[PDB]
Amino acid sequence: NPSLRMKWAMCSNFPLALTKGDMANRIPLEYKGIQLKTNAEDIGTKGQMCSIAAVTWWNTYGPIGDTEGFERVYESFFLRKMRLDNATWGRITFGPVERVRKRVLLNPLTKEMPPDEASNVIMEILFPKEAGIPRESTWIHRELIKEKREKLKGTMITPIVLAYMLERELVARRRFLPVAGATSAEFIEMLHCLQGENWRQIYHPGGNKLTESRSQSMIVACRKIIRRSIVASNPLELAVEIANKTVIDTEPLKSCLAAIDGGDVACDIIRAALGLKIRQRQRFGRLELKRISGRGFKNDEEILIGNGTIQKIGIWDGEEEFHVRCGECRGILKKSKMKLEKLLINSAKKEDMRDLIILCMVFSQDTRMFQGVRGEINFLNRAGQLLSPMYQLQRYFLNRSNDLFDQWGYEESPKASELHGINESMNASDYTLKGVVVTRNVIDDETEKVSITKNLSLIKRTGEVIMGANDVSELESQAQLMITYDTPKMWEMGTTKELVQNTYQWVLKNLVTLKAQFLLGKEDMFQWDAFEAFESIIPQKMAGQYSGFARAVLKQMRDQEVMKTDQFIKLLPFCFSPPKLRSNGEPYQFLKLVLKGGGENFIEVRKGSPLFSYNPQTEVLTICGRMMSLKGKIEDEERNRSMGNAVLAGFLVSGKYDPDLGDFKTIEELEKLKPGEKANILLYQGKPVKVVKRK
Amino acid sequence: MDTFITRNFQTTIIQKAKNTMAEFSEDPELQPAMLFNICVHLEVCYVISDMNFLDEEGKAYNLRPQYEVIEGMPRTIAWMVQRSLAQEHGIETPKYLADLFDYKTKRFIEVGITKGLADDYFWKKKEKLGNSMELMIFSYNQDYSLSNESSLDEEGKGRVLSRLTELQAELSLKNLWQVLIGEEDVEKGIDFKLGQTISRLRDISVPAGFSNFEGMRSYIDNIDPKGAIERNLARMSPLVSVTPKKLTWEDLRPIGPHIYNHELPEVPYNAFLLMSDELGLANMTEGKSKKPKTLAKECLEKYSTLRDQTDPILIMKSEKANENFLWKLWRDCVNTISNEEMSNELQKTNYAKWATGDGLTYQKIMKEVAIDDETMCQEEPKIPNKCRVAAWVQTEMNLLSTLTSKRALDLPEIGPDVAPVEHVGSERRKYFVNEINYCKASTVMMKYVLFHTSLLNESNASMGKYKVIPITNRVVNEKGESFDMLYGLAVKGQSHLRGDTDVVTVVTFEFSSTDPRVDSGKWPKYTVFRIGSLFVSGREKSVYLYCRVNGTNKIQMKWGMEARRCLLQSMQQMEAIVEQESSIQGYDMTKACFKGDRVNSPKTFSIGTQEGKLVKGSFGKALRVIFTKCLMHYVFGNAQLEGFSAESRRLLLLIQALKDRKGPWVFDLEGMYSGIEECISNNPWVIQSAYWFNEWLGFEKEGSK
Amino acid sequence: MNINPYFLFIDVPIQAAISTTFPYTGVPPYSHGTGTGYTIDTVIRTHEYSNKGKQYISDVTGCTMVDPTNGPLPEDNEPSAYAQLDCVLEALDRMDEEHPGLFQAASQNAMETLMVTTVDKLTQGRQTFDWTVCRNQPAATALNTTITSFRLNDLNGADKGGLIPFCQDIIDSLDRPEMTFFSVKPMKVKDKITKVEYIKRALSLNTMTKDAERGKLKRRAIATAGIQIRGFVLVVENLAKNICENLEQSGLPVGGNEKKAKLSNAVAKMLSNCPPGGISMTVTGDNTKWNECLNPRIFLAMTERITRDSPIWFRDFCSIAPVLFSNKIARLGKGFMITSKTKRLKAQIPCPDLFSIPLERYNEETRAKLKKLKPFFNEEGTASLSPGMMMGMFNMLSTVLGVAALGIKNIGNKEYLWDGLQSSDDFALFVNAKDEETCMEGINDFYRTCKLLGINMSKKKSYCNETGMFEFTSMFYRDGFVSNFAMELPSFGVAGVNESADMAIGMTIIKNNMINNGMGPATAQTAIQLFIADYRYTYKCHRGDSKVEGKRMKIIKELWENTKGRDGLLVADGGPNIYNLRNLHIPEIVLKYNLMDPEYKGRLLHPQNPFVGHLSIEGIKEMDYDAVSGTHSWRTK
């Protein structure tokens, strides 16, 4: 058994093989009663055995060795991590996925080499003196050799590791793996997350340090603003407030939006909400329209879908011509009542034109598109509201492209030299989708003000809808710059640690106002936006009980003057949620309040937790590892009264540890106690206390 | 070198050579060497057939050349066309691959591009082939050897010589000539002669009716056995038939009816540790995971009343159990765990020796002595006893699937989720853990895994010592309080486990609140004393000590350490269901699956029966039930369960087919029923599975109407 | 109220929840003691299905030989190995007609692969029966021992490097009057054996009970062959694989996504090819006594027919392996244990002394077994097993035979067609006709045809139902939705090398199990959690803020307090777990590098760290993995 073989090595005094010399003796013979190394007189090997904890000692107090050039040695792993970091994640789709077994070069390579040639070059890079007889791959591969000489110079790392990493980046490692539409080497390293046996995930590996940092940041910022606004009632005021109180690391978002004419939809929506200038063009998701000729009327009627359901739709009737475009690929579309007359496109990336054409199909309202639906089309939105029928078909066919292609039908491509057809996979062929043709004569691709409504929809001066709140692309990504925000309403974006830190900072800064309002005794001080954001991380099932306990303890704190700043700060954030008392009418009781994420994400009610700690000797508040001083708001009597009267509801201190009364009492029996009875509790190890219930 | 290969050869040549390699299945990147050779070969076989054509009458100079290339194209097509030419022209077909065919001499060309001297290479190619083909060997040292006179004129020979003029030096000047591998190496092994002894073995390895191997080879090569299958089928007896039989709900009789026979004893309790009757002595702690011995000492200190008991009331005695010895062993365990010494070793005393079964293995003697002896005979193997249904298994299933106000799982953390896939994974884990963590089955599994880990560690590290191993667990209630639960104590015997199946005996004394006399048939294996009473819910509930002798090997302990895998089997399962309901809807259905939404109502599963009526539970309830089923599969897993599941899967699939109105057929139903029934001997889970299968089959029959 | 787990199936299809019926959480069955009983049972069963064939005495080894092929046709439904050569040839010829040139092309491909193959390839196999010591040893060790032995006897073919000279030496060794070899008696020694004894040892087979087999109540024995035949079986299997790759109905060799794709494509093709108004029915079959009933002589004929248009030398090379298999001899294992309970005494009777005691002292089962084995027994303790294929090792060739049987597609121009998929010992047979009765007639004709070729479909385990749902090699199909490939999910535990390469191996195995085998996102994340828990428990490196106490954990806590940036710490040092589905493939050290502060980062990445010491090319890479030569790359004692 290999797994068991080392669970017993740790029991050994020294299971590891120590080196010889200075680094052998840098770790002491013993440390705090723990053995690290030994002086064993081996027979003829001169060997020395080192402990297991010695690695921890090296990490803590070990000499700080030189690490220069380490990043250069492991350039392959660093490039992998940068590709992952600089990547953008798309939608996740559920459905049938067909994968084929292929030899697809698991990992990337700086330059693909045969094993012997790779060994020769490596020998040259590391040991030119010991290379032996000069070779020929040394001649031809001079460029890579010279670059690696320039790179691995000066590093003190062992040459064997350098050679191994060089082999990793040179020697190919090919294996048979299943692939479904992702064959690039950059994709295989994430093939595990790319798609399973019943779902697909869109992954776009990052490239270089792209220059469009500001645009990439503001796009995601505005997207989040929209996501937060849509769910909340009256997205208008909340969205404008958020966009006004957001800063891209040096400046407000508004200034950037005015400066750069970027964005696809979210920037336009935010600009309109703030009253700025935007480009004039209709959108239906990733595809934008620019009417050129014709007109149509909107009529509401029922239609039959292939799956066999009836739902009302406002269809557009009349001849129309559009300068349709999607991503980078341009084109022109002819639309009429239930017919796609003719479509022209240009050459571009296959996915770009695929999205273009499918979006034209769904927008065109062709009867074939109605008949090309098989599965249920009950898709939902982020707010949980049913999507409009047209956007429902758009999403369904984006998640399912083969079905519409098969159902639509093909025809013969035109005989013009520059006009040619395309297959389901965008492959040129005589059989082309009806009304769809490729072309080579590229068509060439200025601001106004647009009003906004409650539902974050742009409506022109005459009232036509130009941008819909459902057109926001779901391509999630990470901003290249460290954006910051001030509003509490959006703090849920950050990690629970960050949210807790932000809310505690907010309550600490305005502690005076909170105390002044609390002393009065109303309830509007429990409804602050910061607490609204904080309620997100509290679990719903226990949120009511937590809030009831917090309200009860604060009320007991206020009624009898045992006011303690630490406990007030700790338990204020939980008081938002409506109280949920027991059937007996008494508030629940707790030892520690658990938050979302489990584990460390818990606040201790008695001693302190990693997310909240107090040092009264130095009067220091440690929130999530960050230290602050509470001078000026801490009273000497507060230092005196430690914790006894602010841990339990309806209980107060009456004495000290009395072993005669009994051991420490748990909550199960504490809740069942009757007025006029004295019990004993434990704050933390070595600090017991006695309490008594008060009516 | 590939960048250099592309220079001398166009993309079509490279791709044809790479495809020809693809019919070899060795990494093309590994050795371009022969790739070079083959492409060169291919190249020459094309240059010999570049501008040389023939007319409809035979003019040497329309839509017909004077040559036809074989190399490069797929092997199957190449061979089919080669055979076509051979049969059309009535010429002997070479037994090796053909590289090029001529239209004037009607012969198959073979070409070889060698490094050094050509004549010797020509003779070696003749040795390989002989005279079945005409050979055109070329060598970069301006060397050539052609076996035919008028195969090609001087123009083609000069052209090919010029074409090889660059490659004879171009590789050297850019320093490539050195690593150029020859062409004979890939075909060094051609000679293979059988010895006399192997020849005789082949001769006697001929099918019946043939004198020797030569006759067999001649027969197989010459005779055309058309109609053999039809003739033999016609003359085969009709008795050899599959006996088709359309399946119907009537044919599906209950499986293993003997479990309804009351004469057989009801299947007794045999799980390693108590599962639903466990009574954990709870001690409140707020942190440090102290030593097992220290934890047991503290827990017993809290309940000194139970610990200090010394006048027990013997309630149940097993058939072959020594009550005095068991009680003395229990007292020794308690005293040792309650002493100040860190060591938890028990002196090898008489009662300890009996409980551990010291010195029971039979002595080994020489084979000759046994052979001489007459009274030494191979013992008849013990067969598992037949048992009937027992209600305690149903009670276990019902109780362990019920939610409890505790949490035993303490799974670690993972990195923050970023991509949508990890978001949905986190959602699914959140729901599944929120449901499972509050179930009794999870706590039982944690107890099992922790005890097995401790037992394996002790057996491996204390082979020759008797050790007392407390049965301990760490639990956390909904309010955040942490408790240490002591369920009992285990004595570990000698564990000189050499083989994987070597058995070490463990004596388990486990606290419980169930009076065994309530269900006597459930406790024939357990010696039960009444050690005391406790105040719990306003009542003085009795506390008994179930004492038993069990045994485990290395494999069982290692699998117990891995009992957490049950989670996975459950998780995957439910995940599949979620995935399925995503397919029907096209978007994440996890929230709709668990809690529902405005569009889709929460999912429900038929769970069980109440007063003979089918009842339905929520998604979480079904998850918990399948999790307890996985835990049961663990605790009651053995060959019987494997056989029963494997054989009953077919019956389940047939029932599914009947439900789908797929008119399933069977070929031998009685055989399948016998295969299913022979596995139902004494495993409690197997018996209860048979009972549940009968009940569910009855309900399905009722529904089918 | 009484719960009933099976009631789940009332609301969900069985296939959708088939995983519930697989008890893979339980301890797999394990065999105790000797495997001689099962080996004798296998020998008896193999000789029972062929006793009616021609029986004679081998003139090379003196063993009893039973040859069923060309024997009388069966008259009952019991397993029958009396395959007819004419029918096999007809099936192969028909398959050639459906695949023109496939046989000769595959023969040429295998022959050239065999030219380029080297002796070292033989080291890629699993345990093999070394005859110099008569025990199962790793393939490389057996190859080294046999090469040294051949060196001692003036057989230096392996020196040439190619596989052809090595196999030539192998066959020539059978001609040597006496052979000298290195044995272990422990110390190394030179021992000499006669020609007949060497022949028997080379043809001998080692037998052992199969352990940890799922879904089988009773244990079964398996056989490991010697190193001599590994080359010939390798080339034969390469030839059969080349044939299978081009066969549409061959359910091999790819697994996973291509498997489901092949199942669905076959089903759809089968529906589409149904005459209007007819019916399609699928038979899920299981072959009983698959290994036992197949005869090596039939495989010899198969190889001869496949290499019809191949050079004589290659025909001989292919034919060798069936010849040796047809003359194989089986070792009976360790023997039997006889015990006297009164005296509490036990004694092991080895195989040679099996009959040294009167059979009355054996139990009934062993008594009957030995009584039936008597004729096939040998004085040295081995049994003649001329029929049967106990070791398998012809999965590709057996699959070819099954596909050829599937290729007939009709008998007597009857009104039904049949096709399907075949993989080793499992198959799904689709039949189209005008009515279900005609489909059953066609299935009966297929059963008779399979009987004729030495394949016995199991009537007890097979079944039929209207096309649309079926099972194949643990893959369940129901209306397009294929459930999964039910496979024993492994223990995501400590890999067991060091601290860092351990984590690398764990994450790589999670990634591979996700990418190759069936596992979804939530399952993989729970897998990561479980693996991290086991890793932390094994190395006692729980989180720095984790209040667990321990010897090393104390210094870990001291580090945690000392540390300022806790985000960039390895789990080996009590750091937070950062791994997820996205970053499964990336080593943790590079992930956290940007976060780790120099105070500890410098110590971790110490060039001359005193732990790793001298490294080897195997050490960093040896399956392969990615890691950093830090302080967590230490080695064993």
Author numbering:
A (entry chain C): 44 to 488, 493 to 742
B (entry chain A): 1 to 61, 72 to 715
C (entry chain B): 1 to 185, 205 to 641, 654 to 668
Provide text from the study.
In the nucleus of the infected cell, influenza polymerase (FluPol) uses the viral genomic RNA (vRNA) as template to perform synthesis of either capped and polyadenylated viral mRNA (transcription), or unmodified anti-genomic copies (complementary or cRNA), which then serve as the template for vRNA synthesis (replication). ANP32 is required for both vRNA to cRNA and cRNA to vRNA replication. ANP32 comprises a folded, N-terminal leucine-rich repeat (LRR) domain followed by a Glu-, Asp-rich intrinsically disordered region known as the low complexity acidic region (LCAR). First, it stabilises the formation of the replication complex, an asymmetric FluPol dimer comprising a replicase, which is part of a parental RNP and synthesises the genome copy and an encapsidase, a newly synthesised apo-FluPol, which binds the 5’ end of the nascent RNA replicate to nucleate formation of a progeny RNP.
We confirmed these observations by structure determination of a monomeric form of the FluPolB encapsidase bound to nucleotides 1-12 of the cRNA 5’ hook, which can serve as a model for the vRNA replication product-bound encapsidase. The PA peptides 357-372 and 504-513, containing aromatics residues PA/Y361, W364 and PA/H506 are refolded in the apo-form compared to their configuration in the 5’ hook-bound form of FluPolB, where PA/H506 stacks on nucleotide 11 of the 5’ hook. This suggests that for FluPolB, symmetrical dimer formation and 5’ hook binding might be mutually exclusive. Biochemically and biophysically, this is found to be the case, since FluPolB bound to the vRNA 5’ hook is soluble and monomeric at 150 mM NaCl and, furthermore, does not bind hANP32A. In the apo-FluPolB encapsidase, the PB2 lid domain is disordered (as in FluPolA(E)), but interestingly, is observed in its normal position in the 5’ cRNA hook bound form of the encapsidase, due to subtle displacements of domains. The PB2-N(E) lid is observed when FluPol(E) is bound to the 5’ cRNA hook. The replication product was manually extended from the top of the duplex through a channel into the 5’ end hook binding site of the encapsidase, modelled using the cRNA 5’ hook-bound FluPolB encapsidase structure.
